[PDB]
């Protein structure tokens, strides 16, 4: 089955002085009177941005050592080509990450993510090759080899069935598993409103940036929305009333972006906390927690990366 | 506290000065600018505290789940309580938080041995009841999975379900019967 | 020593072709540390490969209790 | 963190030496303020004359209405507030809002080097409400061992550390090294490992191109 969980959101910063004023000494002098409002906001957006790189680290960086899959793949009748890294493409992206990724100004800067999408995919390949080659053992203490046809049979004796069932029906279980991973590429390709959960986080952030940039084109009650014109065509004593209307208005638009981002950063932190728990209790072990990890009894789970 | 020293556009940041040195109709214009700004400043503190209180309620709720499942019982959830297999955890208070000392058993000194899915004796496939069949080069033994305690394969530690044909990997070895020597 | 990175331009640090764990995080895979201040690509971790074979298991033979 | 006219740390202070015969009573313009570390063992350097109106601060008295030929001492040199009749001396003179403010500290330890390296803060000495303009100044002296160093004060932001008895004991100029700017942002004299944002770099414009059309027929 498949669970798409958001872990991180774009890290963006707004320089308040450039947004509220804009290359104008006259506006900057009025703005300093208001106080530390301008330096309180820049710290909030820095807090959302650092936490957006602890969210990615906790979900993926649970493996201290990078494990590597054996050169000849003889996992007992099981084929994991559609989950294991394929060297022809980005070389870190398997047949399903590439499918997943493809399916997905002024005072404003977007800071770059610390773990590039390749390093996020060398972590997923460690977790996958450690699990196919070791089992629950990699994430507990030292990593110990077990033949895959026998890692399952210990995962089928945790759902209550006995070992004889896997060894007697190993060819059927292998063909049932290989065929089912294959449909997951059709399901996440031909028909995915599944990637919607990750996409709404991209869309909702962009509609909020678009609203901030548009508010720079609203008078708020001054003669004009352009700082140069108010200052150029008015005497210096009476322009200050008109700039103060823009500064109170433009500052209110930035406070609404920062509060709404602090509220939406918190929802992504809860999704990053469930994704870290699902990596440790489902990829790194077998869960008896009903429906935490799939509808059915749980045998194994496999991490795959996504745009965010 | 340091935003009570900002004009917010008024003549002065101190209420007594505005009231004393300006006429009462004019002062209300200057006083209002302070009231609007010093109220936006309180509204921002309260709103950030309301968002920060929720981060603490989530840590307070995870700490209560760790006390019940980790202090008052053993947990099979992986990495909820320490890296390793959980044995017990002890609760210790801190200024405004709790520190939990999580005891865990981390396995060590691994050794590699050859193993088989089942062992065939008398045309029947004997599978390990609880354990792994392992070989020290020449002899086959049943050992527990998480520690090496080699033991002789007997009817007591093995169950029979089938014939040598279905399992791929069956090795052939002798499974002892405790009764035959006594009989 | 000017170096151009994806996260900006870093003046005062020398690129080292080696790789190590991240100390101070500059961004886009580049970190920096006192060697001089050296800018290096981050190393995700050691690289180890479990032997893996159709017929080989490894069983722990001792334990460590760890608080 | 205080914003005021302070002498930038590690600056070039013009050094005038009275040694041969070398006479230094010239045109030093008081652009904003003037630090003045006169160091004189024989007390030859005794006064300063300020002008646009002269706020003379002679050895005898401050009178608000060219050298002193003082010898072993004639004092009739000229080209009304009045005041009480009267090593390194580090006077700082500023003229803000019409008050001439002078701050000064005499350091008992003598200077083996031309200027010692230490933080000695200058305690306010006097403020006079002259209500006048000063554009240039000149020293007044009795050559002997005479060394007066004049460095003009500039607008700057400094973080000053106050001990427990109120004495400034350290300061960090916050426009010098990148580390000094970072210390002001964190409001601490000791930083810790990390990448800390300090300011914003904006490429400033160069010219002002104004382009209108070719234009057609003028007025008849």
């Amino acid at each position: 089955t498949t669970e798409i969980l958001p872990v991180s959101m774009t890290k963006t910063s707004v320089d308040c002085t450039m947004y509220i004023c804009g290359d104008s000494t006259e506006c900057s002098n009025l703005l300093l009177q208001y106080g530390s409002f301008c330096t309180q906001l820049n710290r909030a957006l820095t807090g959302i941005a650092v936490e957006q790189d602890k969210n990615t680290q906790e979900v993926f960086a649970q493996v201290k050592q990078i494990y590597k899959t054996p050169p000849i793949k003889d996992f007992g009748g099981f084929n994991f080509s559609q989950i294991l890294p394929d060297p022809s493409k980005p070389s870190k992206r398997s047949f399903i990450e590439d499918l997943l990724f493809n399916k997905v100004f002024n005072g404003l800067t977007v800071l770059p993510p610390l773990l590039t999408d390749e390093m996020i995919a060398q972590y997923t390949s460690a977790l996958l090759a450690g699990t196919i080659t070791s089992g629950w053992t990699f994430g507990a203490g030292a990593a110990l080899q077990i033949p895959f046809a026998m890692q399952m049979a210990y995962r089928f004796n945790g759902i209550g069935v006995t070992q004889n069932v896997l060894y007697e029906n190993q060819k059927l279980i292998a063909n049932q598993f290989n065929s089912a991973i294959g449909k997951i590429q059709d399901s996440l390709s031909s028909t995915a409103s599944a990637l919607g959960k990750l996409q709404d986080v991209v869309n909702q952030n962009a509609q909020a940036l678009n609203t901030l940039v548009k508010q720079l084109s609203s008078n708020f009650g001054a003669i004009s929305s352009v700082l140069n014109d108010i200052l150029s065509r008015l005497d210096p004593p009476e322009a200050e009333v008109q700039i103060d209307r823009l500064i109170t208005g433009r500052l209110q638009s930035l406070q609404t972006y920062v509060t709404q981002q602090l509220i939406r950063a918190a929802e992504i932190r809860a999704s990053a906390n469930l994704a870290a728990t699902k990596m440790s209790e489902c990829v790194l072990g077998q869960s008896k927690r009903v429906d935490f990890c799939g509808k059915g009894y749980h045998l194994m789970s496999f991490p795959q990366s996504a745009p965010h | 506290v340091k935003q009570l020293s900002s004009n917010f556009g008024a003549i002065s940041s101190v209420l007594n000065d505005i009231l004393s040195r300006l006429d009462p109709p004019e002062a209300e214009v200057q006083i209002d600018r302070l009231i609007t700004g010093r109220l936006q400043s309180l509204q921002t503190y309260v709103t950030q505290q309301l968002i920060r209180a929720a981060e603490i309620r989530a840590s307070a709720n995870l700490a209560a789940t760790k006390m019940s499942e980790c202090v008052l019982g053993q947990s099979k959830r992986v990495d909820f309580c320490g890296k390793g297999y959980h044995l017990m955890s002890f609760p210790q208070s801190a200024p405004h938080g709790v520190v939990f000392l999580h005891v865990t058993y981390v396995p060590a000194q691994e050794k590699n041995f050859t193993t088989a899915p089942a062992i065939c004796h008398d045309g029947k496939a004997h599978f390990p009841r609880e354990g792994v069949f392992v070989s020290n080069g020449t002899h086959w033994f049943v050992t527990q999975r998480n520690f090496y305690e080699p033991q002789i394969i007997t009817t007591d530690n093995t169950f029979v379900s089938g014939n040598c044909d279905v399992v791929i990997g069956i090795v052939n070895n002798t499974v002892y019967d405790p009764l035959q020597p006594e009989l | 020593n000017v170096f151009q990175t994806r996260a900006g331009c870093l003046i005062g640090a020398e690129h080292v072709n080696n790789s190590y764990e991240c100390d101070i995080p500059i961004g886009a895979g580049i970190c920096a540390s006192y060697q001089s201040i050296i800018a290096y690509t981050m190393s995700l971790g050691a690289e180890n490969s479990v032997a893996y074979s159709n017929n080989s298991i490894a069983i722990p033979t001792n334990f460590t209790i760890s608080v | 963190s205080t914003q005021d006219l302070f002498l930038p740390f590690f600056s070039n202070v013009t050094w005038f030496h009275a040694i041969t015969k070398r006479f230094d009573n010239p045109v030093l313009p008081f652009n904003d303020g003037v630090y003045f570390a006169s160091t004189e063992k024989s007390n030859i350097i005794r006064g300063w004359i300020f002008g646009t109106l002269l706020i003379v601060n002679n050895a005898t008295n401050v009178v608000i209405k060219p050298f002193l030929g003082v010898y072993y001492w004639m004092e009739s040199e000229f080209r009304e507030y009045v005041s009480q009749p009267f090593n390194l001396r580090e006077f700082v003179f500023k003229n803000i809002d019409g008050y001439f403010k002078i701050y000064s500290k005499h350091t008992p330890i003598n200077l083996v080097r031309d200027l010692p390296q230490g933080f000695s803060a200058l305690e306010p000495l006097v403020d006079l409400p002259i209500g006048i303009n000063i554009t240039r100044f000149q020293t007044l002296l009795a050559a002997g061992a005479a060394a007066y160093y004049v460095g003009y004060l500039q607008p700057r932001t400094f973080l000053l550390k106050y001990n427990e008895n109120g004495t400034i004991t350290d300061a960090v100029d916050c426009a010098l090294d990148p580390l000094s700017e970072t210390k002001c942002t964190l409001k601490s004299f000791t930083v810790e490992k990390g990448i800390y944002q300090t300011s914003n770099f904006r490429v400033q414009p160069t010219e002002s191109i104004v382009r209108f059309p070719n234009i057609t027929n003028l007025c008849p």
Side-chain angles (χ1 to χ4, degrees), chain A residues 1 3 5-62 64-68 70-81 83-91 93-94 96-98 101-103 105-132 134-144 146-151 153-165 167-170 172-180 182-183 186-196 198-222 224-226 228-232 235-278 280-283 285-299 301-308, chain B residues 1-10 12-21 23-39 41-66 68-71 73-109 111-129 131-144 146-165 168-169 171-178 180-182, chain C residues 1-5 7-22 24-56 58 60-66, chain D residues 1-39 41-52 56-57 59-67 69 72 74-78 80-87 91 93-101 103-109 111-125 127-140 142-194 196-201 203-220:
Chain A
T1 84
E3 181 138 11
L5 269 168
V7 312
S8 70
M9 55 182 309
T10 73
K11 307 179 52 198
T12 70
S13 192
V14 175
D15 187 1
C16 61
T17 59
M18 287 196 55
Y19 178 88
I20 317 289
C21 291
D23 55 74
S24 41
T25 64
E26 320 283 307
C27 174
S28 74
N29 298 152
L30 282 143
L31 188 54
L32 60 91
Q33 293 177 180
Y34 282 75
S36 61
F37 284 146
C38 183
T39 314
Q40 169 189 339
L41 292 169
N42 308 342
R43 102 166 74 97
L45 296 157
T46 288
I48 316 175
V50 175
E51 207 184 34
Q52 294 300 320
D53 287 330
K54 179 185 58 185
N55 294 346
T56 315
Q57 293 177 335
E58 64 189 3
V59 175
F60 293 109
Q62 315 218 5
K64 310 175 182 179
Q65 307 206 182
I66 303 301
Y67 298 96
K68 286 283 296 305
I72 294 169
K73 315 297 182 72
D74 215 351
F75 291 118
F78 297 81
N79 205 35
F80 299 103
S81 298
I83 64 186
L84 277 189
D86 208 344
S88 321
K89 294 187 283 292
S91 166
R93 288 187 233 166
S94 50
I96 296 184
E97 295 158 353
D98 290 328
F101 282 103
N102 292 348
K103 207 162 187 294
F105 302 104
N106 289 337
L108 295 174
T109 59
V110 188
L111 310 169
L114 164 71
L115 273 183
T116 59
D117 289 345
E118 292 106 37
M119 293 183 284
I120 294 169
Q122 198 176 2
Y123 275 125
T124 72
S125 64
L127 288 154
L128 273 144
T131 169
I132 299 176
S134 284
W136 55 106
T137 83
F138 85 107
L144 309 145
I146 184 83
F148 192 86
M150 196 175 181
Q151 171 186 156
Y154 282 147
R155 288 180 178 267
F156 251 60
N157 210 329
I159 65 198
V161 175
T162 59
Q163 323 197 4
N164 48 43
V165 171
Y167 300 120
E168 301 197 328
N169 306 53
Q170 187 186 331
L172 173 69
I173 301 170
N175 298 358
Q176 279 173 354
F177 175 93
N178 295 347
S179 94
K183 292 198 278 290
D186 309 355
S187 150
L188 277 180
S189 161
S190 72
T191 36
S193 42
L195 270 307
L198 301 176
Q199 251 164 345
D200 74 53
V201 196
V202 185
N203 297 333
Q204 69 190 2
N205 312 333
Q207 47 89 359
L209 295 174
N210 269 355
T211 199
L212 208 66
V213 177
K214 259 80 163 190
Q215 309 278 349
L216 292 185
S217 86
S218 299
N219 317 314
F220 297 105
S224 181
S225 56
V226 201
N228 278 355
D229 289 349
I230 304 183
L231 281 170
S232 64
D235 219 53
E238 293 177 350
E240 90 175 349
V241 186
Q242 311 278 275
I243 315 298
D244 214 51
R245 289 193 141 274
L246 250 60
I247 294 169
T248 59
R250 288 176 179 182
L251 183 59
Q252 171 94 340
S253 314
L254 202 49
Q255 293 177 335
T256 81
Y257 173 82
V258 179
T259 305
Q260 293 177 335
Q261 303 284 136
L262 287 169
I263 302 166
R264 296 213 260 93
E267 84 175 10
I268 307 298
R269 201 186 47 246
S271 185
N273 299 340
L274 191 66
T277 294
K278 264 145 173 302
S280 61
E281 307 185 13
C282 290
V283 175
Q286 176 189 14
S287 295
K288 296 281 303 277
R289 294 188 59 193
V290 188
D291 302 344
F292 183 47
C293 273
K295 293 179 179 179
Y297 300 123
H298 191 239
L299 296 166
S301 163
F302 299 116
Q304 296 280 88
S305 52
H308 272 130
Chain B
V1 168
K2 280 153 53 177
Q3 293 177 335
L4 295 174
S5 78
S6 286
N7 308 311
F8 294 111
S12 195
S13 290
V14 183
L15 295 174
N16 284 357
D17 298 355
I18 300 186
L19 287 162
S20 89
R21 78 179 175 93
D23 285 2
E26 293 97 66
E28 95 183 352
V29 174
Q30 316 284 347
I31 306 278
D32 184 1
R33 292 187 143 275
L34 258 45
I35 294 169
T36 73
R38 288 182 183 174
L39 181 53
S41 75
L42 200 43
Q43 266 290 157
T44 71
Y45 170 66
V46 173
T47 296
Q48 316 303 311
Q49 297 285 128
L50 289 170
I51 312 184
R52 286 189 184 107
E55 293 177 350
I56 307 305
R57 218 191 311 104
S59 310
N61 293 342
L62 183 64
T65 301
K66 302 200 181 218
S68 57
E69 283 148 43
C70 290
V71 191
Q74 199 182 6
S75 67
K76 204 133 177 52
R77 310 179 56 192
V78 185
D79 221 330
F80 186 53
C81 271
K83 302 185 179 182
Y85 306 111
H86 192 235
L87 285 176
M88 49 200 328
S89 158
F90 301 117
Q92 301 271 279
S93 70
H96 269 137
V98 50
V99 161
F100 284 99
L101 313 175
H102 297 303
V103 179
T104 52
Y105 169 98
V106 161
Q109 299 189 24
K111 276 182 52 189
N112 44 11
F113 309 93
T114 78
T115 61
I119 294 169
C120 212
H121 172 73
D122 204 14
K124 295 171 306 179
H126 305 242
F127 295 81
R129 198 178 310 272
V132 175
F133 285 127
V134 281
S135 157
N136 58 331
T138 76
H139 293 128
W140 281 96
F141 290 131
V142 186
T143 178
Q144 69 193 54
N146 287 139
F147 198 81
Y148 180 60
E149 217 183 9
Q151 267 184 345
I152 308 290
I153 315 155
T154 68
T155 69
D156 310 351
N157 53 22
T158 58
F159 66 85
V160 179
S161 46
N163 59 343
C164 295
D165 309 350
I168 314 174
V171 298
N172 193 327
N173 189 266
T174 52
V175 171
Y176 158 74
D177 172 31
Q180 273 307 312
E182 316 308 286
Chain C
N1 209 21
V2 162
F3 167 49
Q4 169 90 29
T5 59
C9 165
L10 182 71
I11 305 172
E14 30 169 348
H15 194 266
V16 68
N17 267 354
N18 241 340
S19 173
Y20 316 110
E21 224 76 11
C22 194
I24 307 171
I26 296 176
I30 307 290
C31 293
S33 51
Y34 206 47
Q35 208 197 187
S36 197
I37 303 184
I38 41 162
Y40 50 86
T41 304
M42 176 186 16
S43 174
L44 296 198
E47 192 127 329
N48 85 288
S49 165
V50 202
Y52 193 74
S53 199
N54 289 337
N55 39 27
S56 74
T61 73
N62 212 26
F63 36 85
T64 302
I65 316 280
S66 64
Chain D
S1 172
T2 41
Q3 177 143 347
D4 206 18
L5 277 63
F6 288 102
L7 180 72
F9 270 14
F10 302 98
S11 177
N12 274 332
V13 283
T14 323
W15 169 26
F16 295 85
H17 197 174
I19 188 63
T20 63
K21 277 72 60 185
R22 273 292 283 187
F23 189 63
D24 297 326
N25 272 47
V27 186
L28 294 85
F30 207 80
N31 315 303
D32 257 9
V34 159
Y35 166 86
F36 195 113
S38 148
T39 67
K41 38 210 246 174
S42 317
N43 310 356
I44 300 179
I45 313 193
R46 42 194 292 182
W48 312 270
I49 313 170
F50 304 82
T52 326
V56 175
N57 297 355
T60 66
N61 47 5
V62 178
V63 173
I64 281 70
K65 18 180 169 174
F67 50 80
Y72 155 75
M74 188 193 66
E75 11 80 38
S76 53
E77 343 285 347
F78 59 97
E80 297 188 13
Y81 173 84
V82 74
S83 206
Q84 52 273 3
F86 327 92
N87 298 348
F91 288 87
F93 315 110
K94 322 194 319 172
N95 195 268
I96 298 306
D97 290 18
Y99 286 88
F100 182 79
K101 305 177 181 176
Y103 307 80
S104 72
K105 163 154 295 304
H106 307 256
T107 84
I109 309 100
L111 58 142
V112 185
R113 187 75 291 274
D114 296 356
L115 274 179
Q117 311 189 322
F119 296 86
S120 62
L122 313 171
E123 306 205 343
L125 193 81
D127 180 8
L128 325 158
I130 315 309
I132 210 55
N133 314 131
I134 304 181
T135 303
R136 174 230 165 170
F137 97 96
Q138 40 181 350
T139 182
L140 165 128
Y148 75 92
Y149 315 85
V150 165
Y152 316 108
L153 302 187
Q154 301 179 23
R156 269 295 187 271
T157 306
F158 274 45
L159 183 81
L160 314 158
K161 181 191 300 178
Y162 286 87
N163 55 3
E164 187 192 347
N165 303 344
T167 301
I168 297 183
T169 170
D170 268 339
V172 175
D173 185 6
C174 284
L176 197 71
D177 303 334
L179 176 57
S180 303
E181 191 179 20
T182 319
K183 286 175 179 175
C184 264
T185 302
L186 273 67
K187 297 290 185 304
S188 72
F189 267 66
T190 53
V191 279
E192 295 288 340
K193 304 190 49 179
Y196 294 117
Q197 285 228 17
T198 75
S199 79
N200 299 287
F201 171 67
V203 166
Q204 216 76 83
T206 49
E207 300 109 336
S208 64
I209 56 151
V210 181
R211 321 199 27 82
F212 283 119
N214 267 327
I215 294 175
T216 158
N217 283 354
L218 313 176
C219 277

